Design an enzyme around this catalytic site. Structure first.
Site, PDB file in Angstrom:
ATOM      1  N   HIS A   1       0.803  -0.723   0.295  1.00 40.32           N
ATOM      2  CA  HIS A   1       0.064  -0.457   0.196  1.00 40.32           C
ATOM      3  C   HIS A   1       1.375   0.995  -0.289  1.00 40.32           C
ATOM      4  O   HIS A   1       2.605   1.271  -0.095  1.00 40.32           O
ATOM      5  CB  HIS A   1      -0.923   0.308   1.369  1.00 40.32           C
ATOM      6  CG  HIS A   1      -0.358   0.113   2.105  1.00 40.32           C
ATOM      7  ND1 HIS A   1      -0.073  -0.837   2.978  1.00 40.32           N
ATOM      8  CD2 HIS A   1      -0.375   1.312   3.295  1.00 40.32           C
ATOM      9  CE1 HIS A   1       0.656   0.003   4.353  1.00 40.32           C
ATOM     10  NE2 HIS A   1      -0.191   1.242   4.778  1.00 40.32           N
TER      11      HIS A   1
ATOM     12  N   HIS B   1       1.183   4.439   1.937  1.00 39.73           N
ATOM     13  CA  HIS B   1       2.148   4.262   3.168  1.00 39.73           C
ATOM     14  C   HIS B   1       3.915   4.696   2.730  1.00 39.73           C
ATOM     15  O   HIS B   1       4.825   3.340   1.901  1.00 39.73           O
ATOM     16  CB  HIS B   1       1.954   4.129   4.257  1.00 39.73           C
ATOM     17  CG  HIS B   1       0.558   4.540   4.393  1.00 39.73           C
ATOM     18  ND1 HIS B   1      -0.260   3.731   5.391  1.00 39.73           N
ATOM     19  CD2 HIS B   1      -0.048   5.232   4.402  1.00 39.73           C
ATOM     20  CE1 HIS B   1      -1.516   4.562   5.321  1.00 39.73           C
ATOM     21  NE2 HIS B   1      -1.487   5.340   4.686  1.00 39.73           N
TER      22      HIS B   1
ATOM     23  N   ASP C   1       5.908   3.167   5.198  1.00 35.39           N
ATOM     24  CA  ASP C   1       6.271   2.246   5.537  1.00 35.39           C
ATOM     25  C   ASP C   1       6.305   0.998   4.798  1.00 35.39           C
ATOM     26  O   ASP C   1       7.330  -0.505   4.760  1.00 35.39           O
ATOM     27  CB  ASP C   1       5.814   1.452   6.943  1.00 35.39           C
ATOM     28  CG  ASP C   1       4.176   1.367   6.495  1.00 35.39           C
ATOM     29  OD1 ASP C   1       3.251   2.167   6.123  1.00 35.39           O
ATOM     30  OD2 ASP C   1       4.279   0.077   7.460  1.00 35.39           O
TER      31      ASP C   1
ATOM     32  N   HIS D   1      -7.291  -1.351   5.801  1.00 36.79           N
ATOM     33  CA  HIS D   1      -5.646  -0.108   6.786  1.00 36.79           C
ATOM     34  C   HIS D   1      -5.545   1.079   5.827  1.00 36.79           C
ATOM     35  O   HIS D   1      -5.084   2.405   6.069  1.00 36.79           O
ATOM     36  CB  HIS D   1      -4.672  -1.394   7.091  1.00 36.79           C
ATOM     37  CG  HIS D   1      -3.759  -0.322   7.066  1.00 36.79           C
ATOM     38  ND1 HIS D   1      -3.500   0.644   8.181  1.00 36.79           N
ATOM     39  CD2 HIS D   1      -2.936   0.063   6.201  1.00 36.79           C
ATOM     40  CE1 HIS D   1      -2.522   1.195   8.025  1.00 36.79           C
ATOM     41  NE2 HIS D   1      -1.872   0.950   6.970  1.00 36.79           N
TER      42      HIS D   1
ATOM     43  N   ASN E   1      -2.533   2.786  13.260  1.00 39.67           N
ATOM     44  CA  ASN E   1      -3.316   4.303  12.335  1.00 39.67           C
ATOM     45  C   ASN E   1      -4.024   3.860  11.357  1.00 39.67           C
ATOM     46  O   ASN E   1      -3.883   3.394  10.354  1.00 39.67           O
ATOM     47  CB  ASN E   1      -1.925   4.436  11.402  1.00 39.67           C
ATOM     48  CG  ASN E   1      -1.795   5.525  10.866  1.00 39.67           C
ATOM     49  OD1 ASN E   1      -2.890   6.583  11.073  1.00 39.67           O
ATOM     50  ND2 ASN E   1      -1.143   6.038   9.975  1.00 39.67           N
TER      51      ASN E   1
HETATM   52 ZN    ZN Z   1       2.179  -0.009   8.497  1.00 36.02          ZN
HETATM   53 ZN    ZN Z   2      -0.632   2.146   5.511  1.00 38.34          ZN
END
Ligand code: ZN
Ligand code: ZN
Ligand code: CL
Ligand code: ZN
Length: 232
Positions: free
Chosen positions: A84, A86, A88, A149, A180
């Site tokens: 995804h 983000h 990280d 998420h 988150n």
């Molecule tokens: Zn994550």
């Molecule tokens: Zn994430």
């Protein structure tokens, strides 16, 4: 033996953990939102090459990840899939690109990474647009379970090893909150986990985005925690 935890990994270093024949996780740490978090990715043997799933959360970490892979495994990383948008997951894509790794993500992930200002995987994965879509990609299957998420989140199954990598759509048992949820779809997340449960009942190892691996119970755990969060 003994999966590494956050206290065992200084920010900047990366550990590998063999999960099964030809499947490892990589574990890194990062300072985020006032705490230090661990983060997992996956490495899957692809003949005499390696398929990487996710960066190690940033350029510095991802450089360490490539060095550790050469040291411990010694096969070249030729492709990477980010699960995804983000940081990280895509943070360190430019380091992969400079090292000659072909970086991939869905169109939705690439678009969202651009909107967010994050690093953008070069290649676009086809066939992952709608909830329930799956495609084979080398030695794994990529599955879009629906929003959870994040709206774009993918999970990854290694059929030869019965390993399911959930990324940040699956929580470790230690985690009581849903993490988150700024970009989450809390309403759909349990339905998306059910799609995963129905598609991969045979999974023996389940790797969450952050923290300790377990078994298929991690899926039920995730829907428990996500529902509890929704309810306050
Ligand atoms: Zn994550
Ligand atoms: Zn994430
Ligand atoms: Cl958009
Ligand atoms: Zn639980």
């Amino acid at each position: 033996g003994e999966y590494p935890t956050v206290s065992e990994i200084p920010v900047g270093e990366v550990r590998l953990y063999q999960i099964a024949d030809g499947v490892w996780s990589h574990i890194a740490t990062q300072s985020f939102d006032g705490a230090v978090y661990p983060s997992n990715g996956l490495i899957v043997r692809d003949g005499d090459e390696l398929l990487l799933i996710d960066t190690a959360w940033g350029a510095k970490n991802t450089a360490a990840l490539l060095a550790e892979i050469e040291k411990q495994i010694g096969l070249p990383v030729t492709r990477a899939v980010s699960t995804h948008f983000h940081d990280d997951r895509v943070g360190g894509v430019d380091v992969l690109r400079a090292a000659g790794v072909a970086t991939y993500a869905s169109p939705s992930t690439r678009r969202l990474a651009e909107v967010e200002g994050n690093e953008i995987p070069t290649h676009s994965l086809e066939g992952l647009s709608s909830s329930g879509d799956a495609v084979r990609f080398g030695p794994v299957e990529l599955f879009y379970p629906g929003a959870a998420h994040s709206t774009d989140n993918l999970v990854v199954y290694v059929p030869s090893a019965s390993v399911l990598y959930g990324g940040c759509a699956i929580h470790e048992l230690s985690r009581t909150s849903a993490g988150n949820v700024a970009d989450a779809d809390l309403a759909e997340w349990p339905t998306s986990i059910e799609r995963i449960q129905q598609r991969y009942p045979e999974a023996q190892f389940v790797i969450p985005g952050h923290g300790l691996p377990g078994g298929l119970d991690l899926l039920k755990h995730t829907t428990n925690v996500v529902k509890a969060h929704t309810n306050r």
